[PDB]
Amino acid sequence: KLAVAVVCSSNMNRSMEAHNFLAKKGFNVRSYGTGERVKLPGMAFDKPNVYEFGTKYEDIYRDLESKDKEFYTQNGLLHMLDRNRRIKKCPERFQDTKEQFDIIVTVEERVYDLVVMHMESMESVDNRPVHVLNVDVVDNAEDALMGAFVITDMINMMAKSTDLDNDIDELIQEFEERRKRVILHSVLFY
Prior knowledge:
The protein has a five-stranded mixed sheet, with helices on both faces. A two-stranded antiparallel sheet has the order 3-4. The radius of gyration is 17 Å and the shape is globular. It has seven helices and seven strands; from the N terminus they run βαβββαααβαβααβ. It folds into two domains: 1-35 and 92-190, 3-Layer(aba) Sandwich (Rossmann fold), CATH 3.40.50.2300; 36-91, Helix Hairpins (Helix non-globular), CATH 6.10.140.550. By secondary structure, the protein is an alpha/beta fold. β3 (38-40) and β4 form a beta hairpin. It starts with a strand and ends with a strand.
């Protein structure tokens, strides 16, 4: 019943996986990235595949396939892109998006800093609150859904709350103790 957004850095792995779960659960959710360019793993640790933040996931899939068709279907990148084409049209940049939410769950500290850093950029008349919650999650694809699970278990809990803004500060305190995690939470204005 609330607007949610998950944010990793390339809106490829983590963010999408949480995006899937939160959606198949019924939650109103969007997913973005903060990076400059979508970047995926390549043949080396120093040789990746970088793309425009506007390219179709469909084309990125076409691209990889018309290259190391084998390699990429194996490590997962092709199936992953397969899971994404069926939800969103193509990866989006958080920074540039008129869309607005109540809860913005980032997936890495590094990003948490960008989402906030940019939230403090403009300032509108709306003046209604949005909570930026960080829930660390390894960029790895295996942990991706392992994080979604955590990520949804927390929003699901926060979901059912007649007055989020007040007790949300305590729900986090409880979620922190139940999952033995460190949920960075900061206050930004829309």
